Amino acid sequence: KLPPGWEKAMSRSSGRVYYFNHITNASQWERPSGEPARVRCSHLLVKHSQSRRPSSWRQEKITRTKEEALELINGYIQKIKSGEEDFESLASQFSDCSSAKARGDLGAFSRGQMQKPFEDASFALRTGEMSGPVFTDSGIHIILRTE
Ligand SMILES: C#CCN1CCS(=O)(=O)CC1
């Protein structure tokens, strides 16, 4: 039917069908289009109190809850999708990863290097595509595949 991980769903508010990916947590109205040894991705990380290391260059001690972190992630996705803000701009200002200094860019990587939820979502994206919330032991991520 559809590319890896995509399924059909019904909207509760409109009754219109949409498409959802259970590997990347992306969702969209339009039917999705169309594996490599390496991919290149940026990300924006929001840490929380249950993060493996509850510390970032932005905050010496992170206090926010997992639920607050997810609401922050949700709002950033909104601004990116509406075009009010660029992914790169929000990653530079707000990512709790030190890669914020390079606009969220992590370079190219193979399977076997990143935490598995991150790796799975990164390899299920197509070039140019962005994920929904992705959960790992570091926090909550938005992943953008660039190559
Ligand atoms: C490299 C690096 C920083 N971070 C990337 C996403 S992760 O979830 O694989 C944990 C490590």
From Swiss-Prot:
Please list the GO biological process terms of this entry: cellular response to hypoxia; negative regulation of amyloid-beta formation; negative regulation of cell motility; negative regulation of ERK1 and ERK2 cascade; negative regulation of protein binding; negative regulation of protein catabolic process; negative regulation of SMAD protein signal transduction; negative regulation of transforming growth factor beta receptor signaling pathway
Gene Ontology MF, one: cytoskeletal motor activity
Q: Ranges for the WW domain?
A: 1-34
Which principal EC class is assigned to this enzyme? isomerase
The reaction(s) catalysed by this protein are: [protein]-peptidylproline (omega=180) = [protein]-peptidylproline (omega=0)
Q: Outcome of altering K47A?
A: Loss of peptidyl-prolyl cis/trans isomerase activity. No effect on the interaction with IRAK3/IRAK-M. Abolishes IL33-mediated increase of IRAK3/IRAK-M protein levels
- The parts of the chain that form a coiled coil are none
Question: What are the alphabetically sorted keywords of the record?
Answer: Acetylation, Cell cycle, Cytoplasm, Isomerase, Nucleus, Phosphoprotein, Rotamase
According to its UniProt record, the EC number is: 5.2.1.8
UniProt-listed SMART domains: WW
Q: Which cysteines are joined by disulfide bonds?
A: none
Q: What is the effect of changing S55 to D/E?
A: Loss of peptidyl-prolyl cis/trans isomerase activity, nuclear localization and cellular function
Biological role stated in the UniProt entry? Peptidyl-prolyl cis/trans isomerase (PPIase) that binds to and isomerizes specific phosphorylated Ser/Thr-Pro (pSer/Thr-Pro) motifs. By inducing conformational changes in a subset of phosphorylated proteins, acts as a molecular switch in multiple cellular processes. Displays a preference for acidic residues located N-terminally to the proline bond to be isomerized. Regulates mitosis presumably by interacting with NIMA and attenuating its mitosis-promoting activity. Down-regulates kinase activity of BTK.
Q: Domains: what does the record tell us?
A: The WW domain is required for the interaction with STIL and KIF20B.
Q: In its UniProt entry, what is this protein called?
A: Peptidyl-prolyl cis-trans isomerase NIMA-interacting 1
Q: Give the species.
A: Homo sapiens (Human)
